[PDB]
C-alpha cells in the first residue's frame, strides 16, 4: 500500500524529515548521495510504506525477493534513491498498525490450479492482487482466492500475503523517484 | 584529501558538559559523513555517534543514548558532540572520520573505504 | 542484536610468517566488514573496504576474503611496521557501528 506523494513545482529541504528521523541506509541508483539534494528537477515523488529493516537485502534495485515482482518496484531508466531510516518515537504524530505484511505470491493461478505463470508488477503501479488483499495479514501465508466473473474475464484470480510482525521502533521505506526536464527543473533546494 | 582538525585535549569535571570540535576541509562538506568513536585507554575501540551533516540525521550507540547530542553547522563545516552526566568511564581519546566523500563514485554514503581519522582530543575527568 | 568476536588476541607471529585473524559478526551482514589498522598512541589507518578491495596505498597485499559472518585477513609476508593493533567494523544498515574488541599482533621470541 506504499503511500505516495508527488511534489511539483516547489522548493524544499528535504534535510528536515531526515533529521526529524534516524536513517540507516540510503542507496542512491545512478546518482551521488546528495547529488539528487544538491541538483535540482522537474518533479520529485517521495513513497512512505511499512517495510521491515531486517529485509535489506529484499529491497534492492535487483532481486529475486518477493517485494521486487509484487510488493514495490522502481524505474530502471530514471535514478532512483532508497531511504531505510527511524522515527525516534519522541513524536506522537505517527502511531503504529499491527504488523507488517507483503504480498510473497502473485502469479495468474489457472482455472486447473497445475501451471502456474508468476505476474509481476511493473515501476508506479499497485499489484492486482493488492486490490483482493486488505490492509494487513492476520496469520502467516494467508491466501485469497476471489470469485472471478465472466465480465472480470474468468479464470482464477489469486493473492497471497506472509507475516513479518514489528518491534517496539517503526521501521519504514522510502522511495524516491527523480524525473530530469527540458526547462522546467524547478523543485529546488547580498 | 579529506582533512580533519580537532580540539586541544580538556579537563573538566564528572557531572559536566563537554563540547568538542571536529572541523573538515578538502572534501566537500554535503558528501562526507561525521562518525564519533571513543578509545579508552589500554582498551578495545568503541563508536559512539554517527552523524550525516547535511541531512542532520542522528544515530546512537546503545550504551551512550540520550547522553550523547551531536550537532553539524554545514557552514562553518563544524561537528560537535555534547556529552553531560560525565564519569571515570568517559576520560578516554576521542576521534571523528569522515567517510570517503560521493557525488561521483558511491551509493551507500560511506561505500568505498569510509573513515579518515583527526588528531584526537584526551578528555580528562576529575571531580 | 550485533555482538563481535574477534580472533584470540596476541597472535604470535614472527617476521615474515603469514598471520591469518578473523573477526565474526552476530548475524549476517554479508557484504560489509572493513579492516582498521590502529598504531599505538596514534590515529587508527584504513586497510580493506567491505573485506572485498584494499584501500589505495595499502601494500603488502593484505588479503581479506570471506561472506556472510565469517571473515578473514591474510598477511603473507610480515614486517616490523605490518606489526600493530587491528580491529574490524561493521557497517550498512548504521544502526550501530559495532567496533570489534580486537587483536595485538607481537613478535614471537
Known amino acids: 500500500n506504499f503511500k505516495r506523494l508527488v511534489f511539483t513545482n516547489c522548493n524544499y529541504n528535504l534535510t528536515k524529515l531526515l533529521s526529524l528521523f534516524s536513517v540507516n541506509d540510503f542507496t542512491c541508483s545512478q546518482i551521488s548521495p546528495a547529488a539528487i539534494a544538491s541538483n535540482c528537477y522537474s518533479s520529485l515523488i517521495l513513497d512512505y510504506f511499512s517495510y521491515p529493516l531486517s529485509m535489506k537485502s529484499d529491497l534492492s534495485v535487483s532481486s529475486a525477493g518477493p517485494i521486487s515482482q509484487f510488493n514495490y518496484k522502481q524505474s530502471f531508466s530514471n535514478p532512483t534513491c532508497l531511504i531505510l531510516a527511524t522515527v525516534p518515537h519522541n513524536l506522537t504524530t505517527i502511531t503504529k498498525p499491527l504488523k507488517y505484511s507483503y504480498i510473497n505470491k502473485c502469479s495468474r493461478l489457472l482455472s486447473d490450479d497445475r501451471t502456474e505463470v508468476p505476474q509481476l508488477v511493473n515501476a508506479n503501479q499497485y499489484s492486482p492482487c493488492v486490490s483482493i488483499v486488505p490492509s494487513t495479514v492476520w496469520e502467516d501465508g494467508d491466501y485469497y482466492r476471489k470469485q472471478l466473473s465472466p465480465l472480470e474475464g474468468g479464470g482464477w484470480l489469486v493473492a497471497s500475503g506472509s507475516t513479518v510482525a514489528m518491534t517496539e521502533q517503526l521501521q519504514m521505506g522510502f522511495g524516491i523517484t527523480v524525473q530530469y526536464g527540458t526547462d522546467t527543473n524547478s523543485v529546488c533546494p547580498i | 584529501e579529506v582533512q580533519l582538525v580537532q580540539s586541544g585535549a580538556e579537563v573538566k569535571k564528572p557531572g559536566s558538559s563537554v563540547k568538542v570540535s571536529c572541523k573538515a576541509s578538502?572534501?566537500?562538506?554535503?558528501?562526507?559523513?561525521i562518525c564519533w568513536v571513543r578509545q579508552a585507554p589500554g582498551q578495545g575501540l568503541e563508536w559512539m555517534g554517527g552523524?550525516?551533516?547535511?541531512?542532520?540525521?542522528?544515530n546512537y550507540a546503545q550504551k551512550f543514548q540520550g547522553r550523547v547530542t551531536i550537532t553539524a553547522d554545514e557552514s562553518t563545516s563544524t561537528v560537535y558532540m555534547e556529552l553531560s552526566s560525565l564519569r571515570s568511564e568517559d576520560t578516554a581519546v576521542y576521534y571523528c572520520?569522515?567517510?570517503?566523500?560521493?557525488?561521483?563514485?558511491?551509493?551507500?554514503?560511506?561505500?568505498?573505504?569510509?573513515?579518515?581519522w583527526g588528531q584526537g582530543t584526551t578528555v580528562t575527568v576529575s571531580s | 542484536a550485533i555482538r563481535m568476536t574477534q580472533s584470540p588476541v596476541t597472535l604470535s607471529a614472527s617476521v615474515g610468517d603469514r598471520v591469518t585473524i578473523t573477526c565474526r559478526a552476530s548475524?549476517?551482514?554479508?557484504?560489509?566488514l572493513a579492516w582498521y589498522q590502529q598504531k599505538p598512541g596514534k590515529a587508527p589507518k584504513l586497510l580493506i573496504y567491505?573485506?572485498?578491495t584494499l584501500q589505495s596505498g595499502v601494500p603488502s597485499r593484505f588479503s581479506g576474503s570471506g561472506s556472510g559472518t565469517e571473515f578473514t585477513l591474510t598477511i603473507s609476508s610480515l614486517q616490523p611496521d605490518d606489526f600493530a593493533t587491528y580491529y574490524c567494523?561493521?557497517?550498512?544498515?548504521?544502526?550501530?557501528?559495532?567496533f570489534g574488541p580486537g587483536t595485538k599482533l607481537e613478535i614471537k621470541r
Open positions: 567491505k573485506a572485498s
Open positions: 548475524q549476517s551482514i554479508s557484504s560489509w
Open positions: 572520520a569522515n567517510s570517503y566523500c560521493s557525488s561521483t563514485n558511491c551509493y551507500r554514503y560511506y561505500q568505498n573505504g569510509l573513515d579518515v
Open positions: 567494523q561493521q557497517y550498512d544498515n548504521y544502526s550501530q557501528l559495532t
Open positions: 552523524i550525516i551533516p547535511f541531512f542532520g540525521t542522528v
Open positions: 578538502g572534501g566537500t562538506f554535503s558528501s562526507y559523513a
